[PDB]
Write a protein that binds this ligand. Structure first.
Ligand SMILES: O=c1[nH]cnc2c(Sc3ccc(Br)cc3/C=C/P(=O)(O)O)c[nH]c12
Length: 282
């Protein structure tokens, strides 16, 4: 793992190298990377340049912290996030969330792409996360596993209240405020480890357990954020409808996820920029 002083060192280094003092951390899901373009007084740090900071395994598109202002909120954005299917243990995946805390961040916005399990959902829909099912966590893949540091939080923190009530209201409001043809979905995100896509039998399992969307991220970051006392809001871009019957002759693919990512780009960047106004000042 990391010692408390590895995080302190990373935080202080970043404070020594930017005048930016962020209040909101935003983790961009696959196809919301553009959102760093909306920042003003943007200062970029490649992960490779930051002490202790896991480096990306995707040489094609690498990973950056961008400090800057979004809609008059002091932000730090992660463009390129870590997943456990890449081989990172969860203490590396969620390492940034503890750095954010020590930078003085008090709010985390997490976005992801996800497959629709709720049949009412359509490709392009945004689902606000009311709740999650942490399948890896049940089995021992929980990012708080190991010694607990009281300087971060309690041994046994609650997650029943993980996704801020207030921010979810203010999000539904903001959505009405802009009108929009399709309605804003709300529901349960189930994390699976991946990286392979679900069988029909697996899809039926996740439906039966009461999940509306399934993806391979987000939940560990949420747990570590909550363990710190960060306010947490997030959502899923529904990129694909999960094949739930053997009669179907369609299959889930990387391309159709990326393509949905490119389509609903503006809408999500637009939505997240306006939501900054709805985040309390410190
Ligand atoms: O049907 C599905 N089952 C299980 N998982 C998924 C995901 S998750 C994903 C799949 C492909 C690419 Br390309 C990117 C990501 C997200 C990455 P993230 O950082 O946004 O979470 C999308 N659809 C499904």
């Amino acid at each position: 793992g990391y010692t408390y002083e590895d995080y302190k060192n990373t935080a202080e280094w970043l404070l020594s190298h930017t005048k930016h003092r962020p209040q909101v951390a935003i983790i961009c899901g696959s196809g919301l990377g553009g959102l760093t373009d909306k920042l003003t007084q943007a200062q970029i740090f490649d992960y490779g340049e930051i002490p202790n900071f896991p480096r990306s395994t995707v040489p094609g598109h690498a990973g950056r912290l961008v400090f800057g202002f979004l809609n008059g909120r002091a932000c730090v954005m992660m463009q390129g996030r870590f997943h456990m299917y890449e081989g990172y243990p969860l203490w590396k995946v969620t390492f940034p969330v503890r750095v954010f805390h020590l930078l003085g961040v008090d709010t985390l916005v997490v976005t992801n792409a996800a497959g629709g399990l709720n049949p009412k959902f359509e490709v392009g829909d945004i689902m606000l996360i009311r709740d999650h099912i942490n399948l890896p966590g049940f089995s021992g893949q929980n990012p708080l596993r190991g010694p607990n540091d009281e300087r971060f939080g309690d041994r046994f923190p609650a997650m029943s209240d993980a996704y801020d009530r207030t921010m979810r209201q203010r999000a539904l409001s903001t959505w009405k405020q802009m009108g929009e043809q399709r309605e804003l979905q709300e529901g349960t995100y189930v994390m699976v480890a991946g990286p392979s896509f679900e069988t029909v039998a697996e899809c039926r399992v996740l439906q039966k357990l009461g999940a509306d969307a399934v993806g391979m991220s987000t939940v560990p970051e949420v747990i570590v954020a909550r363990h710190c006392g960060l306010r947490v809001f997030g959502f899923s871009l529904i990129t694909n409808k999960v094949i739930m019957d053997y009669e179907s002759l369609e299959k889930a693919n990387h391309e159709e996820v990326l393509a949905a990512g490119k389509q609903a780009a503006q809408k999500l960047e637009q939505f997240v920029s306006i939501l900054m106004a709805s985040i309390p000042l410190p």
